[PDB]
Amino acid sequence: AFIERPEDFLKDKENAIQWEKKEAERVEKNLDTLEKEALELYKKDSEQISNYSQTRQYFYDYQIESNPREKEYKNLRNAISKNKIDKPINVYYFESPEKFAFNKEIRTENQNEISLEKFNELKETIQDKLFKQDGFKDVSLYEPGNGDEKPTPLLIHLKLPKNTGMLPYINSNDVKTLIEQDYSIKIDKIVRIVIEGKQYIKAEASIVNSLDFKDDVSKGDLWGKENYSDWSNKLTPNELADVNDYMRGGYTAINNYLISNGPLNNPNPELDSKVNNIENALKLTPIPSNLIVYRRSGPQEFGLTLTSPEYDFNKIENIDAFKEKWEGKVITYPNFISTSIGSVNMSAFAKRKIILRINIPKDSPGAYLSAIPGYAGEYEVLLNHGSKFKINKVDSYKDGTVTKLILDATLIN
Amino acid sequence: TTALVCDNGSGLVKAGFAGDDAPRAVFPSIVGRPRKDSYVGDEAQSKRGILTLKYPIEHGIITNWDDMEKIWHHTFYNELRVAPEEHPTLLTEAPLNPKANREKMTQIMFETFNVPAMYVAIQAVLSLYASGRTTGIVLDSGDGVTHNVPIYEGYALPHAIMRLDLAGRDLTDYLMKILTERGYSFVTTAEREIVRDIKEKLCYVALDFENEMATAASSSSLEKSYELPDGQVITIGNERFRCPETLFQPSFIGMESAGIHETTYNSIMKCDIDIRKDLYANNVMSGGTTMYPGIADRMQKEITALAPSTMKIKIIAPPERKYSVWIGGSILASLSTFQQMWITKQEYDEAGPSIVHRKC
Ligand SMILES: NC(=O)c1csc([C@@H]2O[C@H](COP(=O)(O)CP(=O)(O)OC[C@H]3O[C@@H](n4cnc5c(N)ncnc54)[C@H](O)[C@@H]3O)[C@@H](O)[C@H]2O)n1
Ligand SMILES: Nc1ncnc2c1ncn2[C@@H]1O[C@H](COP(=O)(O)OP(=O)(O)OP(=O)(O)O)[C@@H](O)[C@H]1O
Ligand SMILES: C/C1=C/C(=O)O[C@@H]2C[C@@H](CC[C@H](C)/C=C/C=C/CC1)O[C@@](O)([C@@H]1CSC(=O)N1)C2
Ligand SMILES: [Ca+2]
DSSP, rough: SSSSSSSSOOTTTHHHHHHHHHHHHHHHHTHHHHHHHHHHHHHHHHEEEHHHHHSSSSSSSHHHHHHHHHHHHHHHHHHHHBBSSSOOEEEEEOGGGGTTOOOOOOSSSTTTOOOOOHHHHHHSSSOOEEEOOOEEEEEEEEEOOTTTTOOSSSSEEEOTTTOOOEEEEETTTTEEEEEEEOOOEEEEEEEEEETTTTTEEEEEEEEOBBBBBBOOHHHHHHHHHHHHHHHHHHOTTTHHHTTTTSSOOOOOOTTTHHHHHHOOOOOTTTTTTHHHHHHHTTSSSSOOOOOOEEEESSGGGGGGOOOGGGGOTSSSSHHHHHEEETTTTTEEEESSSEEESOOOGGGGGGTTOOEEEEEOOOOOOOEEGSSSSOOOOOOOOOOSSSEEEEEEEEEEEETEEEEEEEEEEEOOO | OOOEEEEOOOSSSEEEEESSOOOOOEOOEEEEEEEEOOOEEEETTTTTTTTTOOEEETTEEEHHHHHHHHHHHHIIIIIIOOOTTSSEEEEEESSOOOOHHHHHHHHHIHHHHOOOOEEOOOEEHHHHHTTSSSSSSEEEEEESSSEEEEEEEEEEGGGEEEEESSSSHHHHHHHHHHHTSSSOOOOOOTTTTHHHHHHHHHHOOOOOOHHHHHHHTTTTTTOOOEEESSOOEEEEEEEHHHHHHHHGGGHHHHHHSSSSHHHHHHHHHOOOOOHHHHHTTTTESSSGGGOOOHHHHHHHHHHHSSSSSTOOOOOOOOOGGGGGGHHHHHHHHGGGGGGGGEEEHHHHHHGGGGGGGGOO
């Protein structure tokens, strides 16, 4: 009955429903065959479907296409963006606080009551963290009250941007909203609220946009070249000579010199004078926008060996152990740090088990190295040595029989 | 007069005259200075004490031009014994050689050694050519690096080239490692050359690594004897194949990269689908490190098991293999129709060093 919905329906279930049905009717009429069919498969099987869309991009390209589940993903993706929003909107869903890297427990099932203690902990575990968000999910258009399901004590109030794709669809008797998460989320403010005489945490979240090419290494390359082609040259007469040093086939000399501290223990101006430039090579054209990149990392970077038993993530204790040790913490890299713009696996590191997913703020030290020709063919972004990264979150997925880690991180500097 | 083929690897240099069927000059790619001031080749191993050994080529890319120079110099005069000026010169180069090296190879060859003509061919290509083909996939594995190099119609395909920093050098170190874990001790830089020899004499790839392990652990039949320079004898067992196994399972050596069979399928798969058929049926193996008995049959198995069951798989691995990049060099350089393809000094002296960019 609104002619144009408000930006936030707040507690007003009845109007939100009245507007979304009208909208669900419209939009469904615009789906094609494959799209509807996709929707019809989501309803019947949404958990397994969402799971797939969370961790879809980490396999080899050919493992991605050859997936019986990828057909459906692509179709549901298309469906979702078919209808991009109007203008911004606010949505409501519940999370598990696990999701935010709070592995403890707000207050259990039967308590209707939330510790000031636990509450402050939470506020602390999520303040100044971005948390990357991926995969399909159902969201609601108004705040829950008496009558609505309320499965967790954690309630997320999210402001979707002007252009988000959003699918309102009928399912038996109610109206549901489908979205594809693709951004990271900052929590600005969390407050305690009550509903049906019960206590719940309410998180105010906003989207910080970063570019993320995931498996579309092509899309990525175009971007990369679009920024780093005039850089290939621009880099001046003495940095030009120096640049072609890490990018001279062998890096286990230039890193290995930085790892076990060469600088102020072992000084060797034959590489220092190399570095003070190979560093300014990256500082030539700093990153032109918030960019996600992917590093596949090996056991050393996390104080283990190939053979360490605490590296077997097929056993959850080791995950739980890994998380205690790393989640929340900020790690520093003495090495130039070598990432790719695309999440796909590859022969050079086919078997590495720690994926580092890095959000890089706009304006930071780096470069699309893969913009030189010849050298060309792995979509590499180099990050400046002495970089520090904040590990906000540890996820995991099965890759074949081998379990791996996805570390959601932000480059602080 | 008669052309020249000089194949520059990270361990060995293979060098000779076009049209012969084997390199006359085969010698180590090392330059020695001390703490009077320059030594190359063998009479730099000889020397090892007074001087410090550098390998000018690292992982098949040229990393110190000043030493290459010495290398190339020794080659012409101390080795082949001719003069840069009387002979044209074919040179090889690793895949994904950056534009500047190629460029710098030119000047130095012209503006220093002063050669009427020269050419530069990618290594894997020549190696494919020596076996009569011009489309197919080369596993080229040398002393410091191995490459899966998919080629169609004479052109290497860079997007799909697969590179792997793990070769015979590393396979020797590991042989040194696990031999030591056994009783024996290997320590010097001149004691290594001994294991290197064992490796070449005694290792072999197992058709099926587990059955090898178990046959090894439960009987004596697999155990070869080696005879040290003077007197003593070492005995070697499952090391005999644990070593080249690394190739299929780099984890052996603490690397988490894919192995030889997987990077082949990987490289094939980054290629246009229409051509995959021909890659599979034209898998040519080349390089010192491909010389393990058993290697062809294992590739053929590990590959068979990754590719579509309808696929036809062929693993070509001639005995002349170790020196094939050279041979294809000599074939190429001796060919009547090729003569109008060199880059001549008049070609260089005039138009720039940017000429070498010979994508046909
Ligand atoms: N790893 C990737 O996601 C990625 C993207 S592009 C890419 C390219 O592939 C090739 C392989 O790169 P790479 O991964 O070896 C680069 P790196 O040299 O960082 O890694 C080499 C090895 O050393 C260990 N190591 C690395 N950094 C540290 C550290 N700070 N502290 C302790 N141990 C460490 C690693 O676990 C690994 O075993 C390079 O040419 C690179 O350009 N790798
Ligand atoms: N029978 C053999 N079995 C295993 N390895 C061998 C054998 N003969 C030689 N090799 C190894 O081959 C390597 C040298 O081969 P090759 O000359 O093709 O490499 P390169 O061209 O010197 O260096 P690269 O090819 O890596 O640039 C050495 O490591 C050597 O020990
Ligand atoms: C003519 C000849 C060549 C040869 O055997 O190959 C080479 C020779 C070697 C250079 C070291 C000293 C100068 C030479 C010793 C030569 C002895 C006579 C045999 O570089 C290798 O050692 C590399 C390094 S470590 C390894 O595993 N490969 C393989
Ligand atoms: Ca070689």
